[model samples]
Target: CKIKVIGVGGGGSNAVNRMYEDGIEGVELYAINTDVQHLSTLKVPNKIQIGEKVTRGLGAGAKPEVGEEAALEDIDKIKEILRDTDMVFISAGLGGGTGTGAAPVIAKTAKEMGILTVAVATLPFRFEGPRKMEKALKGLEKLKESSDAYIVIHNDKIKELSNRTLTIKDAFKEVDSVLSKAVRGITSIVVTPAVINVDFADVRTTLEEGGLSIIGMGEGRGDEKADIAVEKAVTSPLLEGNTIEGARRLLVTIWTSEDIPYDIVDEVMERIHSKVHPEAEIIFGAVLEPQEQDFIRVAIVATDFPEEKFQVGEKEVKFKVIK
Candidate 1:
C-alpha cells in the first residue's frame, strides 16, 4: 500500500522529517505559510519519495484566516494526488497556523475521495493559553469527524512520556517515535495477517459515517490462547463498561496466533447482546499472527455511545509487552 504523508505549514516540518526517518515511502509537503523557506533546505533519505511544492502563505505562527484559506486551497491539490494512493497519513502539530486550520479540510477531502485516511495530530499543552488550546480542541474534533482514525498526541502527555526532559527537539523525537510505532504496528498487521486482518476500508467507512472505534491489547505467557487473551483484555471494566447504556455500536478486533474456537466467538456475541443496548449493532473481526512469544492484542471501536462521554478512567489499564 502506498501511504502519502502530507505536512502542512511549519510546525509539521519536524513531523514530516520524522515520518521519513520512520520509513514512510511517499511524502508531500504543503508549505501553507510564507515562512516555510526552511523546508527547501531539508534533506530526506533516498528511500522516500517527495511531491511537488504546494504553497499558500506564513510558516508557523498565528494567521488564522489566511491559514484556513491556504488549507482549503491545499485540499484541492490533495484530492488530485490521493487518487493513486491506497492509504494516506496526514500529520501536523495542530495548534499553529496552517496545520490546525487546514487539516480538517484535507481530511474531509480524502474521505470524499473514499480513501482510507489516518490523521496523527498533536494537541497543545494546557499551559499554552486558552485560545491556543481551544483551537487545538476544535481542530481535533474537526479532524476526527473527517478522518478514518485520528491518533492524538497531547503535548502534556508527551511531557509526561519524556519524564520532564523538556527539550523541543527531544519532545518531538518522542512524539515521532510513538506515532511511528503505531503506524508500523498497524501496517505490519495489515500487510502480514497475524490472525485475521480487518479490512482497512471497513474501518475507514465506519469512521467517516460517524461510527466509533476502539482498540485493546492483552498479553500472556507462552502457549496461551490468542482468542482467550483478546476476549479477557476487552472485557475489562474500563472497556466493556458496567452498564448497558454505556455501550453502543461496537466491534471487537482480536489479534493472536492461537486458533479461535467457534464457541468462544459465539459466547462473546451472546454476552455483548445481553450487555449492550438492545438496538446497538455489533461485529467481530479476528486475526491470528504466528509468534514465537506468547501474548495477545485486542482493539475495539464502538459507536453506541458518544466518544466525549467515555472518559479514560483510572480503571482503564494500559497494555504493554516489554519483551
Candidate 2:
C-alpha cells in the first residue's frame, strides 16, 4: 500500500521537509501552499501552489477564509495530486491563514475519495494572540470532522517539554520532529512485515472514525526489559503531555532480539493493558531485530480518546507590590 503525506501551509511544509531530510522510506511526500516563496524553500519533490488567482502566489495574509478560498479554488488540482495514494496524511499548523484554512478542505477531499486520511497538526502558542487562538480552535474542529483520524500537538506542551528555554527556530523544529515521528511510526508498522504483522487493515480499522490520538516510542535493555519498554512507551513525551489511560484503542508493536522470550511479549502487553482503559481494544505485533541487538523497541499508537482538543493551559502570573 502507498502512503502520501501532504504538508499544507508553513507549519506543515516545514514538517515534511524535516522528515525528508531525516529520511523516510517507501512513502511519497508532497508540499502544498499558496505562497510561491515558501513552497520554493522546501526540498520535497512534488509541490503545488494553490489559490494562485486569489493570493497571486503571495500568501493567505493571516486570514483563514482566504486560505479556504484558495483550497476550494484549486480543489481539482488537489484531487489529482492525491489520486493514486491509498492513504494520505494532511499536516498543518492550525491558526494560520493557509494551513488552518486549506488543511480541512484537503482532508475532506481525500475522505470523499475513500482514502484513509490522518491529520497531524499543531496548535499555536498562547502568545500568538486571541484571534489566532480562536482560529485554531475552529480549524481543529473542522479537521476532526473531515479526517479519519487526527493527532494534535499542543504548542504549550511542546514548550514545557523543551524546558521553556529554546531559540524560536529550534522550538518550532521540535514540534515538527514530533509530527514526523508520528508519521514514521504509523508508516513503519504498516509497511514492514513483522512476526505478527500490523497490516494496513489493522491500521485502517483502528484509525477509521478514530478520534483524537497519541503515539509513543521507546526502547529498553537489560533486566525487566518488557516492563521498562512498556513504561517508556506509555509515558513518552511524544504523547504531548497526554496519558494513554483513556484511549479506546491501542496498537503496540515491538521489535526484539531473537533471544527474547515469548514471556517478554506477554509481559509487555500485560503492562500496557494495565495502563489503558480496561475495555480498550489492543492489537500488538512482534518483529525480529538484528542478531547483535540486545534491546527491545516498542511503538504505541493510542486512539479514540475522550473527545478533546488542544487546550491552552492557564499560565500562572507573578505579581509584585512595591512603592
Candidate 3:
C-alpha cells in the first residue's frame, strides 16, 4: 500500500517539514503552497506551487477566496500528485488563507477519487480573535465533510501542553511534534505489524466516514510499562481534555522491543475496553520492534467523538487521567 502525506500552506509546510526530519519510512511527503518563497524553503523534496499565475507567485494574502481560487486553478496538478495512492494525509493550519481554503478543495477531490483521505489541522489561538476562530470552525467543518477523517489541535492549548513563556518557534515545534506523531501512529497501523495485525482494511473501516478524531500516544518502560503506557496514551497532553468515552470506533496499537507476555497484552486490551462505550467497535495490534529491551509504546486513535466536547471553554469540557 502506498501512503502519501501532503502539507498545504505555511502551517502545513512546517508540519510536513518536521515529519520529514523526524522521518517515517514507507510514506512519501509533499509540500504544496501558493507562496513561492515559503514553498522554496520547505525541506520536502516533492514540492508543488499552486496558483502561481493567479497569486503572482505571492500568497493568498490571508484571503480565503484567493486561496480557493489558487487551488482550483491548479486542481490538475494536485490530482496528478495524489494519483495511485492508497491513502493520503493532508496537513494544514486552519484559520489562515491558503491552508484554510485549499485544504477542503483538495479533500473533496481526494474523496471524489475514492482515496482514504485524512486531514490534520491546527486551530488558531483564541487571542487571534473571534473572526479567525469562526473561519477556522467553518474551514474545519468543510474539511470534516470532505475528508474520510480529520484531527484538530487547538493552539490555545499550547500553553497547557508545554512550558509557559515558550518561544514562538518552540510553540510551533510543539504543535508540529503532536501532528507528526499523530500521523506516525496512523501510518504505523497500516505499515508495521507483527504477531497480531490491524491491516489497511481495519484502519479503513474505523476511519472511513469517521468524524472528528483524536490520537494520543505514550511511552513507558519497567515492570508496569504496559499499564503505564496505556494510561498515559488515553490522557495524552495532545488530547487537551477530550475523552474517548463516546468514540464510535477505537484503535489501539502497542509497540515493544521485546516479546510481551500474553497476560500483559491482554491486560492492556482489557484496560482500553473498559474505558470506551460498550457498543464501540474496537480493534488492536501488537508489534515487535527489535531495538530496546523493556520499553513499550502505545498509540490510540478514537473517532466519531461527540462534537460538543471540542467546543473551547464550554462548561462541559472536562479532563480526566484514567487511574
Candidate 4:
C-alpha cells in the first residue's frame, strides 16, 4: 500500500517538490494551490489550480474565508485527484489563506476514503502578528480534528536554528529538506520490505486513530551508529520543541546492515520507550541491504502528545500594554 502525499499550497508544494528532487520513487505527489505563479513554479506534474472562478487565478490574498470557499468550490475535482489512495499525507503552512483553509478539507476527503490520513502543518512566527496566528491556530484544530493524526512545526522554533544572514530561499529550502526526509522514512514503513517488515497491520495497531504524531528522522554512519541515530531521531528540532515523554505510540524504521546485532533494535526501542509513558505501544521495521552496511537511518513516528502541551501559548497582549 503506497502512501499518497498532497501539497495543499505554496509551502506544501515546495516541500513536496523537495521530495521529488531527492528522487523519492513510487508514490504520487500532487500540488494544489490557488496562486498561478506558485503553481507554475512547482515541478510536480500532477497539480491543479483551484478556485479559478472565485480567485480568477490570482491568489487568496491571505483571507482564510476565501480559501475555504475556494476549496468548497472544487470538492468534486479534489476527490477525483485523491481517489484510490489507501494512505495519505497532507502538508501545508497554516498562516496563509489556501494552506490554512484547504488543508482540512483535503484531510476530510482522504478520511472519507477510509484510510489512515495524516497532516503536517507549519505555524507562522509571532512577528506575523496575532491575526495570522489566530488563523493558523484555528486551522490547526480543524486539521487535527479531521485527520487521523497531525504534526505541526513552528516557524518560531525554526528561527532558533537558522543563521541570521541566511536568505529566505535558503531558510525555506532547509525547512523543505527536513520535511522530505521525514516523509521518505514514513513511506518506507508501508512499502514491502526484505526483512523485519513493519506492515500495514503493525502500523494500524500502533498509529491508527492516534492523534498528533510527531515524526523525527536521521541517518548516521560511524562509531556508535545505532546510538547516534536514535539520539538524532528523537531530538530533531523539527519535532517542534515537544517532549517525547507523553508519547503512547511509536513506529520506528531502521535501515542497517544484515549482520547488525539484535541489540541495536533493543537499544533504540528501549531508550525511546523509556521517554514515553508506561503501556506505550512501540512498533518497528528494519531492512537489511548489503551495499549500505555502514550507513544507518532511523525514522521514528511518535503519537499521544497531550493536547495542551502541543499548543502555541500565545500570550494575551491585550491584557497589558507598554508605554
TM-score of each: 0.62, 0.86, 0.88, 0.86
Question: Where is the poorest 10-residue window by lDDT in model 4?
Answer: 314-323
Tens digit of per-residue lDDT, candidate 4, span 111-215:
888878888788776667789888887777777777887777776666665566256777778778777867766676567453566677777677667776776
Stretches of model 3 off by over 4 angstroms after superposition:
127-129, 192-196, 237-242, 257-264, 286-293, 306-309, 314-323
Candidate that scores best on lDDT:
2
Local accuracy of candidate 1 as per-residue lDDT tens digits, 175-218: 66655544444554444443445565554444444422333334
Error of 1 at 311 (Å): 6.8
lDDT of 3 by residue, 149-239 (tens): 8877777765575676457777788888878877876776577545466688888888888867777777778988877988888776354
**Clash totals for all candidate models:** 20, 0, 0, 0
Best by TM-score: 3
Off by over 4 Å in 2: 163-165, 193-196, 217-221, 236-242, 253-264, 285-297, 315-323
Instruction: List candidate 1 stretches off by more than 4 Å.
Output: 11-13, 24-35, 41-60, 192-196, 210-323
What CA RMSD would you report for each candidate? 8.1, 6.5, 4.6, 5.0
